[PDB]
Symmetry: C2
Subunit: 207 residues, 2 copies
């Protein structure tokens, strides 16, 4: 789809290592296979937000900030602004705090020319308690607000098809499958592999 | 209560300013009235996590990291560990992602001798959609897991009474009232005032 991001090889690296040397080194080993990297709080809190600009300059990659933004609207605005100022191309935001909290993020993203990904569901066991039951309504909330980028789980394929039905065929969907999602997110299988390149290149072979 | 934190004057400063100079300056202006300061992501992402240790050293204050932790268990562990290593005395965690996500935080806090605050509810308008309906069950989940520190909203007094009933009389409850909560959180009324010290001192006079 032209109006949503192009992710090289439909493979997003979840760079969840917490030290700068390893994150930069392991990312380097697989740089030829991916142009989009997802980073989260453990890395940025440990090493500083300046690491975002570092990735983009050293590897030329898009950065998705997996910050699971989940505050009140005013605070969400400030988190998004700081994150985009640091160079992030996109930010992942929770839907459970409701529509105004999501809209706050969309406002800043539109202002600054960046993207919001709405996290519709999670797949860790505790997600059954509240998240699973809210997933469909959160996805619909996103659609109603004009959200064009979504994160959904891959552990249950039939959940991905359901998400697709809600968000439509054109919105961008990434999942941690490619019949429904536009790109897959892979972390450990790559960054822990004794040969990250052998892991990455292999995954792209199947894709 | 002896086994939960003593907050000076029952007043927590929500230091939500985003630049280091102002945050340190305005905090300095009201330093004698508070020993517990809540810091969030806008400040820490803008200025670095090193600012946490700076607050504790310059003001001798306790720091609560209002990071609204809301990830999977493994990632929650790492966020908590990084935050505690940076010197935070406590961290605020969402309950919506469920019990294992909360327990991950509790594990690290117990290891490192720090505290987890469970956020049971929020008071912005959008909170009605999903958070309001989950609040009682989240508070009960906290109790069942041995959580001793909670954050609840104050805009609805009768919600604080309900929360207090669930968590019992001894757990520590903070809220943005003092008949139910152990301490109140104040931000803008203090840090955005021609004379923050006048605001802080005044608030403390009402508390008796």
């Amino acid at each position: 789809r032209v109006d949503v991001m192009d992710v090289m090889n439909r493979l997003i690296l979840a760079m969840d290592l917490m030290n700068r040397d390893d994150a930069l080194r392991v990312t380097g080993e697989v740089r030829e296979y991916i142009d989009t990297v997802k980073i989260g709080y453990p890395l940025v809190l440990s090493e500083g937000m300046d690491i975002i600009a570092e990735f983009r300059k050293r590897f030329g990659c898009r950065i998705i900030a997996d910050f699971k933004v989940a505050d009140i609207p005013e605070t969400n605005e400030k988190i998004c602004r700081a994150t985009f100022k640091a160079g992030a191309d996109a930010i992942i935001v929770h839907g459970f705090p409701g529509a105004d909290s999501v809209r706050a993020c969309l406002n800043v993203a539109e202002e600054m020319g960046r993207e919001v990904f709405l996290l519709t569901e999670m797949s860790h066991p505790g997600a059954e308690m509240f998240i699973q039951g809210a997933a469909d309504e959160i996805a619909r909330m996103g659609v109603d607000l004009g959200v064009k980028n979504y994160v959904g789980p891959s552990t249950r394929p039939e959940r991905l098809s359901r998400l697709r039905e809600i968000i439509g065929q054109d919105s961008f969907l990434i999942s941690p499958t490619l019949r429904f999602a536009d790109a897959i997110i892979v972390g450990r299988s790559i960054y822990l592999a004794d040969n990250p390149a052998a892991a990455a290149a292999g995954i792209i072979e199947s894709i």
